Structure 1
């Protein structure tokens, strides 16, 4: 609800861009401001969403301002200092216990998101932000959607297909279980420390090849239904990988909820946290 006056706004630098908008670091206190580059109508929804989302593992809304240069509003948020895990992990040697802590927190955050009856549709390492080495936050909701009252699923080249479940690439339906498939891929990223050479796009394209023209997704869909999966990350515990494969069930109903995962991650964490 707070109003930011674009007059006390000093642009420090760019923090990122993707899908619809761009995010820049601003001085006012330091804030991260997101701006919109049909897309317009969703932007009104996204903002409202973030305004009504309050959780220790979801980026904090702080207000809006007059984006004079683009017929709408900008979305002011808190500045998460250490950036996303995709940015951070490649540069910092993090232990397994810590990574599992991040994982548990992502689930806590996702569990809360779903209980608000929202799907995310873009859960990846690039969208998880590091506040400090013991705190992580979901930092973007550009694709987030409200799940229709009387349905269990919600119905683009900018889609993160390498993070998506088969029912998304195939039936174009997005279930809460779909986000869980995404979490599994996000868990994989963490365990590989977001190394570029091991990324979902890179590894999935090694399997599919690049002489597939307009059929990248169709090939992707059918290798997933042959039961093929992302490899086990080196130094990834056996049971953890099993936890990954369980999130990657072809049958979405065989997938654990984020509810179910919190208890399990909590225990696997305490284990290796010793």
Structure 2
């Protein structure tokens, strides 16, 4: 039942490019009548095996469902046709309350992941999938690692805390910084023109590209941050800034954020 066979799997289309692999849509049809379920299949070496071993362990309402494996090994997951928040939000006017629900849902999945002693390492809107209108699922565990220790010794730098950029140490609290950035993306409706790379490169400029990471590190340590999104309530932006505390230990955990987001969700609903 965990094993899928190459002969009964037929390709429909490519879905995208993740960390250490391409994601493709297949229909898995043993019966030969298109009755069988549609599945997302990710394909590749050392780190690839790790993504299979990680996601095999994980089971949660807001983590993408592992279905099985296949001999090319390939990783078979549930298919979520609505795709990512990065894809979805630019075309669908979604209200503030729904966005906060998604935010709550991300933290519940991340709180689960951390309790299993894993860090994600690319928590970004491109890796948050919609199952349905009020159900996010976190995808792409290609950079995910098992914490040995308080951190893993290590790249999407515009989502990364100063300690990752400077000291090459990824903490549980580093994922919370990234969540802060993801929350910024949701509140801008994942608008390209307001994206973290666009905004940070406006602040840094591109006259000296060899020192992008240095200049990014320096501005963050100066206390400069991404602006408040249009129509974002002040309360919510403070929560963002709390996730972007320079000192990692002053950031809330994902367990701390859940009841806060529940209450903020209930306010604007």
Bin of the TM-score, shorter chain as denominator length: over 0.9
By how many angstroms is 1:268 displaced? 0.2
Any runs of at least 4 consecutive aligned residues in structure 1 with deviations exceeding 3 A, and if so which?
none
Tell me the distance in 2 between the aligned counterparts of 1:251 and 1:65: 43
By how many angstroms is 1:45 displaced? 1.3
By how many angstroms is 1:9 displaced? 1.1
Matched pairs, number: 260
1:170-200 Cα offsets, whole Å, 9 max, x none, are 0000000000000000000000000000000
Q: Any gaps of 5 or more consecutive residues in structure 1?
A: 68-72
SS of 1:82's equivalent?
coil
By how many angstroms is 1:109 displaced? 0.1
Tell me the distance in 2 between the aligned counterparts of 1:213 and 1:247: 27
By how many angstroms is 1:44 displaced? 1.1
Tell me the distance in 1 between the aligned counterparts of 2:249 and 2:101: 26
By how many angstroms is 1:18 displaced? 3.0
Q: Is the 8 A contact 2:9 2:27 kept in 1?
A: yes
1:62-90 Cα offsets, whole Å, 9 max, x none, are 001111xxxxx000000012100000000
1:63 aligns to what? Answer: 68
Q: Is the 8 A contact 2:63 2:138 kept in 1?
A: yes
When the two structures are superposed, what TM-score results if normalisation uses the length of structure 1? 0.94
By how many angstroms is 1:139 displaced? 1.3
- Larger CA deviation: 17-26 vs 159-168: 17-26
- Larger CA deviation: 7-16 vs 251-260: 7-16
CA RMSD of aligned residues (A): 0.7
SS of 2:71's equivalent?
strand
Q: Is the 8 A contact 2:127 2:139 kept in 1?
A: yes
SS of 2:112's equivalent?
helix
Q: Is the 8 A contact 2:3 2:70 kept in 1?
A: yes
Does 2:156 correspond to 1:160?
Answer: yes
